[PDB]
Amino acid sequence: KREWNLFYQKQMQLRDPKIEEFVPPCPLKEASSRRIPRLTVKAREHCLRLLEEALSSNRLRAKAVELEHETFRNAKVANLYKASVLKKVADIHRASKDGQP
């Protein structure tokens, strides 16, 4: 029943402190933009460093920033953008296991 959505949102209000603001910087493209939900410079640099480690292990920092910026543009929120970057890191890991460039 639609009563579930009222129950659910009540229980999540009862889960207050204010939400933390964005702070600008970084090697990442457009890193001064606050437009990506829940994003930060530290999360973007962590994803860029993960992409750089995978590309360097397969082998350059330009490709890592391109993979991070593409994924941050396509994902709905920064928490999903980071999970999809780790998924692309796992696919590069299957490429290196297959010996592919």
Partner 1 sequence: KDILCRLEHTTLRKVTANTAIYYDPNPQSTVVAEDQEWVNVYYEMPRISPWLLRVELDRKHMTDRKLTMEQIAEKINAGFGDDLNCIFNDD
Partner 2 sequence: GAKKSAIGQRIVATLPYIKQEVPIIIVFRALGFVSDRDILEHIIYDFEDPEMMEMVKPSLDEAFVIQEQNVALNFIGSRGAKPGVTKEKRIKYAKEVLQKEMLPHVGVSDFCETKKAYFLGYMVHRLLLAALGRRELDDRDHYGNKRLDLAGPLLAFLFRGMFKNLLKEVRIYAQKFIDRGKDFNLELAIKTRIIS
Lay out the site mask for partner 1 across 56-95 (x = CB under 8 A, - = otherwise): --------------------xx-xx-xxx-xx--x-----
Interaction between residue 29 and partner 1 (CB under 8 A): no
Lay out the site mask for partner 2 across 7-46 (x = CB under 8 A, - = otherwise): x---------------------------------------
The interface region with partner 2, picked from 2-10, 14-22, 61-69, 93-101 by CB under 8 A, is 2-10
Please provide the DSSP assignment of the chain as one string.
-THHHHHHHHHHHT--PPPPPP-----STTTT---STT--HHHHHHHHHHHHHHHHHH--HHHHHHHHHHHHHHSSSHHHHHHHHHHHHHHHHHHHHTT--
CB 65 within 8 A of CB 29: yes
Task: State the CB neighbour count (10 A cutoff) for residue 86.
Answer: 15
Residue 96 binds which entry of partner 2, partner 1, none, with Cβ cut-offs from 5 to 8 Å by kind?
A: none
Binding site for partner 1 (CB under 8 A): 8, 12, 15, 38, 42-43, 46, 76-77, 79-80, 82-84, 86-87, 90
